[PDB]
Amino acid sequence: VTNQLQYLHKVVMKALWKHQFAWPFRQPVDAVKLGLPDYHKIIKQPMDMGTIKRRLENNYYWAASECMQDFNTMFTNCYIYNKPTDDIVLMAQTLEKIFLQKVASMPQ
């Protein structure tokens, strides 16, 4: 329960979870539901905010960098998988910018 992890939970996740573009990212990508049969062939390490939030809640992370990498993986999966012009990409980009803006003020 480090100062960094508390920041990532109370400031970063708090902001991202409730954001109006967060909804596609709140649970693991469901390739059946979304009709994406190639999703898991392209994306080998799925990640989502629900998984990250639960991990923060359950003291899963040993370091802040580990949580930061999970956020990063989530956004990166989105950019890699989707078409450049898909709305989801803009949504991720917007959430990622908040992530980085907040992480710039995180404890050391």
Place this chain on the structure above:
Amino acid sequence: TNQLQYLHKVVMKALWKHQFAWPFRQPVDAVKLGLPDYHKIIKQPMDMGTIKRRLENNYYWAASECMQDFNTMFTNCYIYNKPTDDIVLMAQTLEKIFLQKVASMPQEEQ
């Protein structure tokens, strides 16, 4: 600022010398690299050479602004390239170092 100094002398220095950094040290040259669709897909090109020059010329007002340019550079790479391209792995490797070093940045900006 103290954070901008850190981003320049600690974060950028370590990223710059990395064995996977060479594609990212200058703007994407779409003509030289034979990528005629690059600028039709990527509307905000960014690279470490541009960021480094901006740090050296005191372009940035806050660390967050510089960090956003790093993010754009990496995001551009993931958006433009095919999932299976080596450059994607190279960017991922560099971006992990970026996040690692950003975590250790002094928290209050001077």
